[PDB]
């Protein structure tokens, strides 16, 4: 149907909105690991000066 | 009518799909940054 696109898009967009939140969490976990590693390298003299 | 509603839903859909592609790309960049930081820790004897 032409109008039949309505439900399909609605439902895809809900799934994509959810997937964005999962990907934001996983991206944040990786940022926190990067910060942890940068601190370890800095405390050990390996991040410059 | 329905044609305008559909166009708006398609606009939202591409904005969401673009954001997902960005987060997948940035997350893979971050995994590479983690691998490089881990290699430098291993090389300096901080990973056993």
Swiss-Prot record, chain A:
Q: What does this protein do?
A: Voltage-gated proton-selective channel that conducts outward proton currents in response to intracellular acidification. Lacks a canonical ion-channel pore domain and mediates proton permeability via its voltage sensor domain. Provides for proton efflux that compensates for electron charge generated by NADPH oxidase activity either in the extracellular or phagosomal compartments, thus enabling the production of high levels of bactericidal reactive oxygen species during the respiratory burst.
Q: Which organism does this sequence originate in?
A: Mus musculus (Mouse)
Q: Which family does it belong to?
A: Belongs to the voltage-gated proton channel (VPC) (TC 1.A.51) family.
Q: What is this protein called?
A: Voltage-gated hydrogen channel 1
Ranges in the topological domain labelled Cytoplasmic: 2-49
Which residue spans adopt a coiled-coil conformation according to this UniProt entry? 3-43
Q: How is it modified after translation?
A: Phosphorylated in vitro by PRKCD. Phosphorylation may enhance channel gating.
- Expression sites by tissue: Enriched in immune tissues, such as bone marrow, macrophages and spleen.
- Subunit architecture: Homodimer; each protomer forms its own proton conduction pathway.
Taxonomic placement: Eukaryota, Metazoa, Chordata, Craniata, Vertebrata
Q: Where in the cell is it found?
A: Cell membrane; Apical cell membrane; Cytoplasmic vesicle, Phagosome membrane; Cell projection, Cilium, Flagellum membrane
Full protein: residues contained: 220 to 267 of 269
Q: What is known of its domains?
A: The voltage sensor domain (VSD, segments S1-S4) conducts both gating and ion permeation. The segment S4 is probably the voltage-sensor and is characterized by a series of positively charged amino acids at every third position. Unlike other voltage-gated ion channels it lacks the pore domain.
């Amino acid at each position: 149907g032409s109008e039949r696109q309505i439900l399909r898009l609605k439902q895809i967009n809900i799934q994509l909105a959810t997937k964005i939140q999962h990907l934001e969490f996983s991206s944040s976990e990786k940022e926190q690991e990067i910060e942890r590693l940068n601190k370890l390298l800095k405390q050990n003299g390996l991040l410059g000066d």
